[PDB]
Amino acid sequence: GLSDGEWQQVLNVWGKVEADIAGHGQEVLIRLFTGHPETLEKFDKFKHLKTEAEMKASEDLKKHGTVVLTALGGILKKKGHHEAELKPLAQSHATKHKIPIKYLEFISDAIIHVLHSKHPGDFGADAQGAMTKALELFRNDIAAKYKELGFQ
Numbered sequence: 001g002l003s004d005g006e007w008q009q010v011l012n013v014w015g016k017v018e019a020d021i022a023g024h025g026q027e028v029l030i031r032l033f034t035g036h037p038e039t040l041e042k043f044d045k046f047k048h049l050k051t052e053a054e055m056k057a058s059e060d061l062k063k064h065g066t067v068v069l070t071a072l073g074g075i076l077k078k079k080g081h082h083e084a085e086l087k088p089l090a091q092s093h094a095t096k097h098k099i100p101i102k103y104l105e106f107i108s109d110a111i112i113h114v115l116h117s118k119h120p121g122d123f124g125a126d127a128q129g130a131m132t133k134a135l136e137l138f139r140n141d142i143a144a145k146y147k148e149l150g151f152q
């Protein structure tokens with residue numbers, strides 16, 4: 001698990017995200033779609049987005065960014081007692097959306113990059129560590145539900 005000190009750092013970092021959840025959520029998704037265009041194909045609602053300019057200008061992309069990060073914030077604030085919040089996300093991402101676990105690895109890396117991009121020099125070595133642990137716990141707990149389903 002994460003230690004208390006570690007959960008505290010994660011939640012301190014999450015405070016930075018909450019000041020602009022849509023902005024953060026949009027940049028996360030844009031970072032994902034542009035570094036991994038296969039990921040765009042999982043979204044019929046974003047597949048028409050031919051350019052980064054188009055992605056940037058999509059209010060519906062922002063809205064979904066808000067949905068994504070609100071759900072993750074929910075989970076993070078549970079400090080690993082997150083099974084009730086996590087299991088249904090796991091299940092819809094395997095069964096409905098068909099999201100391989102590697103794509104969750106991609107979006108985890110995108111979150112780390114965006115935190116550095118938006119908080120250069122304000123997201124220290126300790127904070128990166130604690131947030132990376134939190135994101136690995138999230139991803140590992142979803143992996144566990146995927147295995148149960150035999151997904152991927």
Ligand code: MNH
Nearest residue numbers: 039042043045067068069071072089092097099103104107
């Ligand atoms: C952080 C990681 C992460 C979180 C917290 C997340 C949370 C959500 C939530 C909440 C919904 C709406 C409820 C549901 O379960 O259908 C949802 C819908 C979705 N998600 Mn995801 N999702 C991903 C990663 C995430 N998703 C990744 C990675 C992929 C693609 C590569 C993805 C593709 C989807 C698709 C597709 C939908 C349905 C979008 C739509 O409304 O049309 N996403």
